[PDB]
């Protein structure tokens with residue numbers, strides 16, 4: 001193997017990136033002034049008197065998120081309109097000036113506390129774009145204000161798992177375009193919350209860039225480093241193939257994808273969209289596609305102006321969670337005999353329920369493969385396979401075969417990348433065994449789990 005391949009096959013996640021990956025799916029909570037004014041885009045300078053939801057019940061939100069199987073929640077602490085959901089000391093444009101809770105409330109506190117009681121991690125979105133704040137457009141003075149608010153959020157509310165950042169901007173009242181001192185912002189986050197992943201407009205987690213309803217066929221976590229300050233764009237179908245990254249040499253990095261979408265057409269709640277909430281089945285397919293396609297899933301659910309998650313959203317979440325649990329429960333009810341093409345001693349690692357142990361074929365194994373034999377003919381429609389990503393991402397082509405009770409065997413399906421998890425789906429079939437052929441790989445693959453199941 002050449003220097004380049006030895007490099008690519010060993011690019012690896014940091015501690016914070018690995019912990020983040022293991023979350024799999026978490027929620028976004030869009031709630032604030034835009035909810036009250038029924039907008040996707042706020043104008044700024046909205047009257048704080050308009051923020052007076054009568055029945056905020058964050059435990060109702062968290063209850064539904066747990067039932068949905070979420071690992072954490074990212075709250076919109078301040079959106080583009082600039083209204084802050086905590087009583088910031090740096091602006092009067094906050095819940096402290098609203099009639100909500102007699103001006104004595106702190107929704108960031110209320111949410112973070114409830115998240116922790118519910119076993120969910122807590123993250124923040126603090127909008128760089130600010131349509132109210134006076135310093136906006138002045139340059140450094142707005143950076144000072146932003147950093148000031150980051151500091152409040154990152155020091156007063158306990159551990160933060162993610163700081164989510166988009167890059168929208170505009171002109172201030174002075175007519176000048178505000179640009180952000182990203183490097184300065186990153187230092188603050190790294191300093192105050194070392195374990196947090198800085199996401200999207202940050203170096204730790206990449207916006208998947210997919211068209212809604214689509215995920216990459218091949219999602220590589222190892223990609224050109226230039227994608228971190230985002231010729232090539234985040235929306236390209238092929239970011240990480242050998243051909244795509246060839247010319248970049250060592251200028252690549254571990255920069256894993258996050259698929260983000262809303263359960264409704266809009267990010268904020270609009271009553272007119274109450275008949276347009278994704279169903280539990282739509283969410284499940286999404287989960288299977290994202291979390292079964294080497295991407296984390298960020299799912300937005302917006303509370304209504306009353307201060308509750310709406311009934312359809314709660315039901316979809318509940319059904320999503322039920323489908324995910326049924327899937328895992330069947331993935332454990334599975335009785336299989338695992339056999340490998342080499343390193344049979346390590347074959348045990350495929351089924352010990354330890355994500356830290358893996359099977360890796362011998363260097364001279366020219367056809368690495370895992371055979372799973374079933375106690376008797378069973379119907380299956382998917383295989384689950386996971387790489388030991390702590391050590392990198394390597395698999396490039398996977399071919400799955402099934403041995404039918406009727407002597408013969410056929411191809412059940414193929415896939416490219418695996419990474420954190422590949423759930424390969426196909427038509428319901430009855431087999432006595434399946435073989436996973438790792439036809440292509442950057443050096444020897446390290447596989448921590450393999451399984452055949454019926455969804």
Ligand SMILES: N[C@@H](Cc1ccc(O)cc1)C(=O)O
Nearest residue numbers: 030076079125166167168267
């Ligand atoms: N393209 C999206 C990105 C985004 C999504 C959610 C946000 O809260 C902020 C930004 C938008 O601006 O609408």
